[PDB]
């Protein structure tokens, strides 16, 4: 049929082979004559999947042995409250670096539970950049320092991560996890809803330093303790088995293309196609982010006025582009170009953008 | 290549629902994307989301003053979310204990407030549902919590108590939409989908709206999800899609009364086999409390138990081992387990008895 270009921001494009693989074995997985969705999570066929998803992640990001990988339900949003529930103890402070709307949502949940602080913020200038690490206001009684690696709605991204030694560094990496190599030991915990760059909705990957959080926290509901899930290897209650399976399949694909290092090269190339288009447009398109902070995962821009914005987005949708409307809170446009978005989609978008401009 | 899926959770699903999923896995609704690749704020997803709710409303005849929520975290998260929202100071979370799942729910409430046991058949190892006239209720109960089907013990409420002093709340994980329900008896009903309704990953919560909050985390307030139609954060979109598909299958076969007929025949096959076995197979539940969803039983000794389950596995039966906490055998016969599987089980039970 006609072309479809999938720039959805979350859930988002999956790599075709992961979907083709799932489709082919949907009714009979691993010769059991059952769908993976119909298996016990205590079955050896399921446990193989669960363990393989962990081992692929471990290998791909080179996660150290003193870290454990959790597969949790509830989305990143549930992590916004689970994190302060476990680590934000009395007399301590949940310190946040604000670099977008998702950082504010994280902060708000800690505020419900303890003392919070704002280490640095670019909110005044509408989150066009990542603040300088030298501006970080740190406290001796900080329970952690929390950052948002990729600011999905604003199109900005950490180029690198601060060295923090007084508290654990925590990061919401929902929209750029495993888009590039990572030095995992810079962090006490990393979390990501899978649906942006790792596969389906319904599971949240939580990489945690075991000794920071393998201990019972008095007064915390069993399901909301990290310890629960660490001890039970994310099998305390019934896991999202199909989501974890699809995550496995996506991880296999990342490994098959050369891992984090190769996918970064691909992601830089796709991003470049779009940013060069913006940058050669003589102001017809204006990127929200400052150049040093441009995200490789979510490209945010506006045309010169809202009428042109709307005509551009209507034309895109007529031409088969999906998901380009900016987040409802900020308007404009947003090209999400996560790992699995193909480069010819990016070329197509550039073509769209150039003819729209020339014809305007 | 014969396989009979008696898994207790996650579990068998309807072949037509899985075949339909397979067929359109790469191209949902002519969008040329998987349902898994759609934005949850897309109309495409939003229609599926709503269709899943609509089918439950139709099939259970859920009144307008109830809302239907799709949450993550399993029935287990509901164990704490419920008291978190309703167990206010000076009130009591009152529990009816009819098995281990009851116990797990009560435990979470004890973290958050005053609790109470209205009744319990624990002393007798949960062989039955207590008589409602036995319940000990309190003026200040925040709710009365029950477990409609005691998955590990094989017992099930035949009917529900008429409770007017406080909302009746039910963990229906292992029997929701296996028979018609009078939803007006309850203030809230909850169930992980992964037994009767869909794959794991989504929890269905049916809640009396006006029934349900300072200082509770946003994600743990029912009001958050009611207000946002379970679209506050990203829902488990594929699981809700599969839930829709399963609900379409239940509607297509004739709805809650029709599936009850199938379920009662399935259970009749196994219980008759047990009852006719002259004590070779012994059911755990008192007759009057026998579950239609999980049939629990043992052979005369542990070694026969083990010989049977080994023979079962060799013959393609999956999931019949009893819960580790109780041992024995458990045949889970949720909605999508076909009558032919139960017939096969019977024939195996009879042959095994003959050959012992
Ligand atoms: C998508 C997103 C979230 C929300 O994740 P849910 O799974 O919907 O809770 C949180 N943080 C970031 C940075 C995101 O991009
Ligand atoms: C399966 C079951 C549960 C556990 O559900 P999860 O989704 O694993 O939390 C809780 N209660 C009952 C009655 C169940 O049968
Ligand atoms: Cl953001
Ligand atoms: Cl977003
Ligand atoms: Cl039970
Ligand atoms: Cl169980
Ligand atoms: Mg490979
Ligand atoms: Mg192509
Ligand atoms: Mg139909
Ligand atoms: Mg008879």
Swiss-Prot record, chain A:
Listed name of the protein: Phosphoserine aminotransferase
Q: Which gene encodes it?
A: serC
> Which species is listed as the source?
Alkalihalobacillus alcalophilus
What UniProt keywords apply to this chain's record, in alphabetical order? Amino-acid biosynthesis, Aminotransferase, Cytoplasm, Pyridoxal phosphate, Serine biosynthesis, Transferase
Ranked from the top, the taxonomy reads:
Bacteria, Bacillati, Bacillota, Bacilli, Bacillales
Sequence positions bearing N6-(pyridoxal phosphate)lysine: 196
Instruction: Name its pathway.
Output: Amino-acid biosynthesis; L-serine biosynthesis; L-serine from 3-phospho-D-glycerate: step 2/3
Enzyme type, top EC level: transferase
Q: Which family does it belong to?
A: Belongs to the class-V pyridoxal-phosphate-dependent aminotransferase family. SerC subfamily.
Q: How does it assemble?
A: Homodimer.
UniProtKB/Swiss-Prot annotation, chain B:
Q: Where, subcellularly, is it found? A: Cytoplasm
Where along the chain is pyridoxal 5'-phosphate bound?
75-76, 101, 151, 171, 194, 233-234
User: What does the record give as its pathway?
Assistant: Amino-acid biosynthesis; L-serine biosynthesis; L-serine from 3-phospho-D-glycerate: step 2/3
Name a biological process GO annotation: L-serine biosynthetic process
E.C. code: 2.6.1.52
Q: How is the cofactor bound?
A: Binds 1 pyridoxal phosphate per subunit.
Q: HAMAP family from the xrefs?
A: SerC_aminotrans_5
Q: Which family does it belong to?
A: Belongs to the class-V pyridoxal-phosphate-dependent aminotransferase family. SerC subfamily.
This protein is called Phosphoserine aminotransferase
**Source organism of this protein record:** Alkalihalobacillus alcalophilus
């Amino acid at each position: 049929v006609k072309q479809v270009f999938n720039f959805n921001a979350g859930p988002s494009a999956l790599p075709k082979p992961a979907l083709e693989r799932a489709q082919k074995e949907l009714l009979n997985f691993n010769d059991t004559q059952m769908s993976v969705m119909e298996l016990s999570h205590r079955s050896q066929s399921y446990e193989e999947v669960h363990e393989q998803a962990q081992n692929l992640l471990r290998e791909l990001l080179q996660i150290p042995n003193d870290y454990q990988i959790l597969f949790l339900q509830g989305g990143a949003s549930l992590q916004f409250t689970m994190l302060p529930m476990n680590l934000l103890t009395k007399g301590t402070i949940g310190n946040y670096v604000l670099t977008g709307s998702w950082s504010e949502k994280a902060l708000k949940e800690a505020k419900l539970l303890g003392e919070t602080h704002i280490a640095a913020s670019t909110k005044a200038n509408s989150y066009q950049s990542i603040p300088d690490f030298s501006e970080f206001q740190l406290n001796e009684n900080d329970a952690y320092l929390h950052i948002t690696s990729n600011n999905t709605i604003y199109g900005t991204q950490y180029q690198n991560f601060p060295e923090i030694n007084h508290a654990p560094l925590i990061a919401d990496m929902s929209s750029d996890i495993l888009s590039r190599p990572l030095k995992v030991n810079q962090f006490g915990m990393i979390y990501a809803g899978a649906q942006k760059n790792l596969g389906p909705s319904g599971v949240t990957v939580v990489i945690v330093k075991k000794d920071l959080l393998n201990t019972k926290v008095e007064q915390v509901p069993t399901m909301l303790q990290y310890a629960t899930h660490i001890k039970s290897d994310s099998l305390y209650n019934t896991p999202p088995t199909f989501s974890i399976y699809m995550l496995r399949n996506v991880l296999d694909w990342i490994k098959d293309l050369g891992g984090a290092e190769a996918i970064a090269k691909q992601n830089e190339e796709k991003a470049k196609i779009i940013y060069d288009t913006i940058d050669e447009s003589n102001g017809f398109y204006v990127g929200h982010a400052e150049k040093g902070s441009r995200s490789l995962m979510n490209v945010t821009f506006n045309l010169r006025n809202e009428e042109l914005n709307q005509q551009f987005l209507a034309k895109a949708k007529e031409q088969g582009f999906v998901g380009l409307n900016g987040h409802r809170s900020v308007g404009g446009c947003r090209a999400s170009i996560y790992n699995a978005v193909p480069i010819d989609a990016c070329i197509a978008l550039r073509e769209l953008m150039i003819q729209f401009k020339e014809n305007a």
